[PDB]
């Protein structure tokens, strides 16, 4: 008596990263035994429960909204955060941070834009947020932006950050930032993170996570532009709507090639919202552009996959 | 024997504009007898045929990709366009312009970003494209950007424009640009546009188009930031996947309020991909946040709606 579970038929290249507002490019698998995989965007159960900081909009990911105050002697502005909906922010909500908050330590560059309500005058400037910085305290309601202006932004007017890409600067050596698997301290460095979506790992020998991979635009320096998500944003939207009950811990998916009619590989979609495959080693999957995922049956954590 | 037609259950505020990569905010209706409504993004038939310049990604809308050449004595760069997938562009495809090309005359501001293949060095700069300019010839494979640099960008390296908002500048007076209902000349001023998605209008007395409305960020001046689309991007994605056959020219939708169980209004979803309502005058609809569209039955162009 359970509504039948499905995944979208969109191809990988027809879908969006759930951790940054950019298209998916490829599937990637690699070992992750040595570190914790705990992203907070792109987290959703197969039955449609959003986790972490996950929200439904592809374009709100890594955005911030609020009003800003200038820091004297600098081009820096403090943003006092509003809700996604431009209402007052509530720090007591049982989430790690405001929905859509970046879930990695990095220097994210974009534009900060503003409109003056009274006359409809507008302004925009290049801006960067360092999510590893001491002033990055989104859970407490404020973050800081480095901008290209010292005087243009007004106080007490709605202000939006739209993310574009990432930078590597200052101290750092090539491709050592951003660090996609390092969570920000949402309340600052001395305060532990709360209400997190859990870390994920394969629990089977010879298995690895399967990642949905994009390349973030780079805006300066020699950044690591790889970005891996656990679920496409479209999948998040799909599960949220469908809300099909998980009949077992694991949904078995087959990846199908329509140009031949054959299955390329099979994988496990865990009910808590992540995918694993049977492979050892780093591998960029090579897939046909029209390839798609198809739900075939419910199995369990003990099911042995065919090697990828 | 037709697969049953449906629309997504996502609420308006949970969906994305199909003409710019920003969230939907509201529903709007107004008269449009006096001018032609012929957007090229967010065009899809109910049975899943993409029209105009429409593509499936919410985040590729109003993007450009290619490589750039500097124009001496300026901060201007010519971009020789690539395909969405970074392959050579084909001008002979039976489309108006490259998929995702802006479908309005305006000054769109964002960031232009670039990566050097050999060493992974990167750069990004604020940039604007004037879609009403003589050099805006995307169908012919090139457009021009005004940037904040005269020497940083390299030749023959992959370069991306990510849109953020719009500006009003130069000569123009308040809120007279952008002009969302004026199509660019995709091949330049002397060449007529081709392969367009058709203009839309209500064909019934006392009917108006229903628009899915957002406010574009403004980056300078006093722009008109209203942006109206005919279909949410999620709807485009949905119809594309479902491909449910249109049993009649018109699908009757009811907009439902779950907080009361009552229908707020009814509307016509035309099979060619647009919505009409029975109302006269400009009106910002007031809707509950959890309100949703529900397909109830197939009717026709002659069906008389209940007044909104
Ligand atoms: C946005 C900006 O102006 N950034 C500069 C940065 O240039 C950016 O990054 C470099 C790698 C290159 O892609 C530029 O096109 C881009 O604008 C500067 O980087 C130095 O840039 C020169 C070229 O102008 C050389 O490429 C040099 O190798 C770069 O230096 C090293 O990389 C930097 C990112 C720093 O880590 C620096 O300590 C390194 O020696 C830097 C350097 O002043 O300054 C801005 O960030
Ligand atoms: C990005 C930038 O520097 N743009 C300026 C522009 O300022 C932008 O737009 C104005 C409306 C305001 O929102 C600024 O905060 C924003 O940076 C300049 O606009 C003049 O700006 C001053 C404030 O610095 C006044 O607001 C003035 O009314 C503005 O002028 C008129 O509006 C302009 C957009 C032009 O149409 C001008 O002819 C008008 O008289 C302009 C003016 O030099 O210059 C850049 O575009």
């Amino acid at each position: 008596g359970s509504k039948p579970f499905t995944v979208p038929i969109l191809t990988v290249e027809e879908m969006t990263n759930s951790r940054f507002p950019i298209p998916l490019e490829k599937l990637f698998t690699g070992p992750s035994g040595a570190f914790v995989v705990q992203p907070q965007n792109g987290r959703c159960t197969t039955d449609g429960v959003l986790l972490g900081t996950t929200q439904l909009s592809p374009v709100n990911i890594c955005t911030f909204r609020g009003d800003v105050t200038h820091i004297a002697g600098s081009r820096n502005y403090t943003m006092n955060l509003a809700s996604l909906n431009w209402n007052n922010y509530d720090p007591t909500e049982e989430i790690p941070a405001p929905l859509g908050t970046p879930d990695f330590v990095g220097k994210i560059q974009g534009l900060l834009t503003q409109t003056t309500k009274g006359d409809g005058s507008t302004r925009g400037h290049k801006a960067t947020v360092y999510t590893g910085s001491a002033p990055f305290t989104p859970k407490l309601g404020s973050v800081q932006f480095s901008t290209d202006t010292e005087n243009d932004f007004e106080t007490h007017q709605n202000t939006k950050f739209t993310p574009v890409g990432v930078i590597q600067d200052g101290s750092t050596t090539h491709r050592n930032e951003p660090q996609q698997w390092v969570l920000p301290s949402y309340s600052g460095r001395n305060v532990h993170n709360v209400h997190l979506a859990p870390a994920v790992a394969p629990t089977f020998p010879g298995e690895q996570l399967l990642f949905f991979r994009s390349t973030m635009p780079g805006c300066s320096g020699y950044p690591n532009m790889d970005l891996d998500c656990l679920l496409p944003q479209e999948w998040v939207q799909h599960f949220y709507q469908e809300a099909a009950p998980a009949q077992s811990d694991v949904a078995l998916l087959r990846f199908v090639n329509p140009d031949t009619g054959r299955v390329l590989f099979e994988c496990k979609l865990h009910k808590s919202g992540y995918v694993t495959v049977a492979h050892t080693g780093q591998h960029d999957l090579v897939i046909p552009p029209n390839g798609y995922f198809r739900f075939d049956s419910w199995v369990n954590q003990f099911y042995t996959l065919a090697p990828m």
Side-chain angles (χ1 to χ4, degrees), chain A residues 116 146 184 230:
Chain A
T116 302
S146 75
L230 307 179

Side-chain angles (χ1 to χ4, degrees), chain A residues 169-239:
Chain A
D169 87 353
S171 316
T172 56
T173 80
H174 299 180
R175 287 164 275 290
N176 272 327
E177 61 167 335
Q179 292 168 283
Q180 69 161 328
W181 302 122
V182 181
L183 296 174
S185 294
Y186 298 119
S187 296
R189 290 167 169 171
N190 288 131
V191 179
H192 79 95
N193 284 339
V194 294
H195 303 293
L196 301 174
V200 302
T203 60
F204 193 111
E207 274 183 28
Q208 295 177 167
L209 291 170
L210 187 67
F211 301 103
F212 299 87
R213 180 169 273 200
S214 304
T215 311
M216 298 180 289
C219 308
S220 194
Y222 306 82
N224 183 345
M225 288 168 284
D226 298 326
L227 188 74
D228 292 306
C229 70
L230 307 179
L231 301 171
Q233 187 67 22
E234 287 84 1
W235 286 26
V236 174
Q237 291 186 337
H238 187 82
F239 302 151

Side-chain angles (χ1 to χ4, degrees), chain A residues 121-123 152:
Chain A
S121 63
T122 71
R123 56 213 64 91
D152 203 24

Side-chain angles (χ1 to χ4, degrees), chain A residues 270-281:
Chain A
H270 302 253
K271 77 167 167 84
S272 56
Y274 66 93
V275 186
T276 61
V277 284
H279 190 79
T280 298

Side-chain angles (χ1 to χ4, degrees), chain A residues 102 104-108 129-138 144 177 179 182-186 188-189:
Chain A
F104 61 94
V105 171
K107 299 165 183 147
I108 299 167
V129 60
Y130 188 23
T131 63
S133 74
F136 193 72
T137 59
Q144 193 178 297
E177 61 167 335
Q179 292 168 283
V182 181
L183 296 174
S185 294
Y186 298 119
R189 290 167 169 171

